[PDB]
Design a protein around this ligand. Structure first.
Ligand SMILES: [Ca+2]
Ligand SMILES: [Ca+2]
Ligand SMILES: [Ca+2]
Ligand SMILES: [Ca+2]
Lengths: 326, 326, 295, 295
């Protein structure tokens, strides 16, 4: 209760941390608009040593916390009920950072908001500091930013909508530029109040991406993945995720002879059987698996093959007890 | 305005029909319970001549209007937002039948409610008349039934739950036993007010059924299909739907040599490409298509094959612009 | 500085089938295609001849009505609905359309209206370039029918609007330019009178039919080997002029003025035969009946 | 006619990893496995020795607490949540658990509680037969951890309940009967102390470890070719008795009394070698320390 002498001074403890409760969502209707407020987390920030890095990976994949109720990577409970509406408006939203490391962890972190959604995620240390809404902060003290709202209603991303910039409240991000260690530091909570209007039949929750050696990116659906998948001719069909959760996939390739997908030795763990067939001109392989984060080498599938023409996947989110013949 | 003589009598017009408007849903919260009232249709009743028939087909497939917010076959807008909750309660629900044929169409129809959900859908003409809640009626006049509610809260069917009888408000059905012609007659509207409680992460909307020559029915997910798919050894892998809408499928078989799926010549139309590969020991074929009703012979896929061991499908609901390489 | 017109015009007919579910009178539903926008010539038919002389608009109030045409003894359910973004996919079963917030069903022998809510913002008219075509529209309209018991025209739908244009652009015209070859389809240019459906390969195969009403002036060139004459009779649309034609060895050019009612049937409108063909072009304008090629 | 006990006991420890997301201290999460029910011996540890002498229950009030055990310098996030049906699937990423309506996170150096709401209906206790096991439970509890930076036990969780049993049944006991063969798994019978994870094939392979705390009495028979002695040392759990053993040609029977702390490590608890094996059986009871095989 009493800190030892002297008096009236600044004291630095070993750790400070708020304790949180999982409050329920609460609804409210008003003039045909349904209003819902809730709080959940997004991710936990991890730092490197001696290297600038933003959003837990070095490629940093522009977007990826695109603030929009259809985005599953940021909101984890909102988008499965936001697919019943075609318009929204944020009435209040703030990002809360709460630490979970000791005071002896070093490396000053930051989190910030941009208004558009294709500014290519800065690399210089000085370019981070000059956003209009940010918080410089040490990695052991809580920091919160508000992000300003509008009156304009936007759309809730049911189609491809390639100029995905007029329908977004902005973009959220965070970065670290010192350190330290290679541990978790804290986790970012977001609490928010939204509106919805003009109810709709339920849209899909299934991504369909295509990739040949060319146009990247002829995709549709909610971006569980984005254009980060490597194939040229060689032992090259690499898929890796960044969004957490557990998914149901189905793949189809084309070209010369192939091999089996070697998922072992990387992120994400099997849960079923993954039946596979092919090896002459095309092959199909479906699976179901869970994954956690994360940024690392030797990515999550490394389908080799010999000489390839096209590849295309379908991704959908599903629980545990949906796998194959167990 | 004035009917010709005589006066004070009963007059039979050529047709009577109400005109309806597509009212929006409306929400309300109260003590942590979200209350939503809405009206939509289910199907349109079609009759045969000289044969008793119930729910537009002769096999009649027990269940199939199982009154439960997870059932997509009855409610078409409710289940995509009812997958965010684990408990419900109906506060008011009635089924409204509105005619759309002339007075010269004959064959007296009926619709009724049962309290359990495995009574095997009667075949005798006399057994139809003695349900506790029903309406005998001619095919040209509107008839409505209420269905009584409880205070008991039930579950919203996120798992297999093989005794699917304690979690349902009952079962809805309708039948015709005379006629007439082979035309549409009317369509059944349902208006309803529900509650929900104890919000949840969004469950899946994807069915996974399995079938070998044996246990039927080792399934999961929302029953877009039910155990109606024929395979024994021979040119036998037949799938046909009854629920309307448009779907994304993926199939996988096992056994001896096979052939291509001949979807042409029946219900349901192609929309994409349906890539297919296999023909030695197993084969994969996915597709995407829309279908309307309906009960007829030569069912919707007739995958032939030569000698088969297992078959298993995955079904999910998705819009139009999701097909393959167009 | 802002004009303000009020008018009530025709959209299209409706055609039901024997007990299925169709949206906007075709299968596969053609995503979009009735995005409500003053340059969309496929739904308005008097408006876009003056919306080509402007750039912005704002619908101040708009309703869609449905008047009957059939006898009172014909079964049916017609429905009218409106999604507020232009490329959400259209529904595929009759169970889905109860979920739309602005819907109104009814029997095919009675009148049926619905409003559609507006907002005080201004948009653009040009749609040849905007991909996505999503923020330049006020919504998307579609009708659907689900019963028997015939294949006849059982009504039509009319709009009743009020617009506010501003800052005029010069009138480029209303002509189309529809090229086509045995391959990629179809590289249109202009308004959308007609359509990404005109069958032709190499055989007795050069077919064009319409689906919008009105009187028209078309020119067409063909290419390839020997071309036969266009026998327009037997299908929709009636000749009003002279139908001049020339050629038959490498190319054949022919103009026509006619009017079509739109409703369809088998054996489509023009149907040139030819012998072996490469490509075809079409220019379609809307113009009245006095401008006929005299004999 | 209705008894009413109030007690506060232990559930299990918690163990975090270096920056991943784990639920209930394993990967693949074992759907169910903490369904809160007075016969579920895997979470309660004093309650089900008297819930075997009843048939119905009603939790009148129940909360779950979490006390710390680690130093204040260790990073982490622990969380406690509750779904009200027993076989909704467990989440797989840390983003999902913000959506549960009854959740409470916190740092691993501070205390954390959560309530769980009750209702005035009575259920059953027996779970060996009810498929589905869904209406016989009051819910499903699970914890999760998502940070670094160690692999040490960083706390444990305790319940604090109040029950109302009624209409007693006769006490059958608390023994298990775990058969196993090189094939189908595993045909348990009784409470769930332990577990569908006990590795054995034919080689130096007959492994059983526990994950619940407490002191136990186990008997075991084996079959096959030559069996070696169980070398219990080196792993979790310490011997308290004499460990008698016999056999080594076709079968070997051996009893043991011990206690284990539950927390785990490598090199599991018993680990018989053997030479070539067919099947194995286990009977597990919970009993105190005075009943040791004397020397
Ligand atoms: Ca949309
Ligand atoms: Ca559930
Ligand atoms: Ca201009
Ligand atoms: Ca008993």
């Amino acid at each position: 209760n009493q800190i030892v002498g002297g008096i009236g001074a600044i004291a630095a403890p070993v750790s400070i941390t708020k304790r949180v409760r999982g409050m329920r969502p609460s609804f409210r209707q008003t003039k045909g608009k349904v209003h819902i407020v809730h709080r959940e987390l997004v991710t936990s920030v991890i730092n490197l040593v001696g290297n600038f890095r933003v959003n837990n990976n070095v490629s940093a994949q522009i977007g990826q916390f695109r603030i929009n109720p259809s985005n599953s990577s940021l909101f984890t409970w909102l988008p499965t009920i936001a697919s019943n509406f075609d318009s929204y408006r944020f009435t209040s939203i703030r990002f809360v950072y709460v630490p979970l490391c000791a005071t002896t962890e070093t490396g000053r972190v930051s989190l910030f908001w941009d208004k558009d959604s294709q500014d290519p995620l800065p690399v210089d240390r000085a370019a981070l500091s000059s956003y209009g809404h940010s918080n410089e902060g040490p990695p052991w003290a809580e920091t919160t930013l508000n992000v300003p709202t509008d009156g304009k209603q936007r759309f809730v991303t049911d189609s491809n909508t390639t100029d995905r910039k007029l329908v977004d409240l902005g973009q959220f991000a965070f970065a670290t530029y010192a350190g330290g260690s290679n541990n978790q530091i804290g986790d970012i909570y977001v609490e928010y109040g939204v509106e919805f209007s003009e109810a709709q039949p339920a849209g899909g929750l299934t991504q369909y991406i295509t990739k040949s050696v060319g146009a990247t990116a002829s995709t549709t659906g909610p971006s569980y993945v984005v254009d980060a998948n490597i194939n040229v001719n060689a032992t090259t069909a690499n898929v890796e995720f960044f969004s957490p959760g557990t998914f149901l996939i189905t793949a189809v390739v084309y070209g010369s002879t192939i091999a089996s997908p070697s998922m072992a030795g990387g992120n994400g763990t099997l849960i079923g059987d993954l039946p596979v067939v092919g090896g002459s001109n095309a092959s199909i392989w479906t699976c179901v698996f869970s994954t956690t984060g994360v940024s690392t080498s030797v990515p999550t599938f490394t389908q080799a093959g010999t000489g390839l023409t096209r590849v295309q996947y379908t991704i959908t989110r599903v629980n545990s007890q949906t796998a194959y013949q167990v």
